[PDB]
Structure 1
């Protein structure tokens, strides 16, 4: 009945946010989403979308004819030019998407690390990493204490004595 965080597995139960908290104490188990990390990721992804929606004001008109085919030579030049340009945009499109997707994935991983590192700095010397993305808290942490961690109102000074004791022996 153990719980685990990021590092081999996501949470299919976290359905109200992208990033979140999962605790277990005497009160049982719980899961809640972190707003600030979730919104940062959402704002960045939607930011990409808007950039890719920015339409062009360039209008293009017919340069050949599909009812009455133009002269061969000028027609082959045109086809050659269009096909050359289509190759360029096909290349651009492929690269743009691959590039953005790599970045989307990386910045998402970044937000996860930043959330983990923040919590680590909140807990100071009162906790230890279990290596699955969790923190073993070396003091009693009820639901109110867990909530204090989620909204950054956790004062490590309050539990430090009790925690260092349990850690050292």
Structure 2
């Protein structure tokens, strides 16, 4: 199996960012509630706030001119096109610019999540180079769930972990 470094998981569904735990009592995916929700309240707010800054925007209205008011008929036309062209630019660019600020927001949220556990584990585990960690100790379906919600007692598993590390340099 493999983490974020080589693609995404069709297996996880309860969220956008999450873990997979392979241990002795069982496998399975599990989303990180905190960061995922954080990416829902954010993207949503982004949407509504795009709509609302567009809630005020120019409104074209038709005006008739006669045969001897060609100069103002043409002024009127350049004016209403002008604003139409300005707001079409502002929308297409706002969307493009914030699309990019969105994909990067996902690409950073993942890496921050990887770093969240890499900081929690340190030498009690070995990072496999594929977005996965191999525990130097046994991690019951209770140490796994400890890591996920950020509640990981390091010294508790510290000893067992250390000994299994120098066995590998025995």
Q: TM-score range by the shorter chain?
A: 0.7 to 0.9
Alignment correspondent of 1:135: 133
RMSD: 2.0
- CA positional deviation for 1:115: 1.1
Which whole-Å deviations, capped at 9, do the CAs of 1:12-38 have from their partners, x for residues lacking one?
A: 121111111101111231211111100
User: 1:127-163 CA distances to partner (integer Å, 9 max, x unpaired)?
Assistant: 1111111111111112122111112222111111221
Q: Return the structure number with greater helix share.
A: 2
- Correspondence for 1:117: 115
- Structure 2 gap segments, 5+ residues each: none
Query: For the residues of structure 1 that align with 2:25 and 2:66, how far apart are their CA atoms?
Result: 79
Paired position in structure 2 for 1:155: 153
Q: Secondary structure at the match of 1:86?
A: helix
How much has 1:93 moved relative to structure 2? Answer: 1.4
Q: 1:39 aligns with which of 29, 37, 57?
A: 37
What does residue 47 of structure 2 align with? 49
Q: Paired residue for 2:164?
A: 166
User: 1: distance between equivalents of 2:103 and 2:140?
Assistant: 35
Q: Distance in 1 between matches of 2:22 and 2:66?
A: 74
Q: Which residue of 2 aligns with 1:89?
A: 87
Unaligned runs of 5+ in 1: none
TM-score (norm 2): 0.87
Between the aligned partners of 1:116 and 1:92, the Cα distance in structure 2 is 36
Change (3 A) 1:105 1:57: closer
Distance 1:69 1:154, change over 3 A: farther
Q: Give TM-score, length-normalised by structure 1.
A: 0.87
Q: Please report how far the alpha carbon of residue 87 of structure 1 lies from its aligned counterpart in structure 2 after TM superposition.
A: 2.1
Instruction: Quote the offset at 1:73 in angstroms.
Output: 2.1
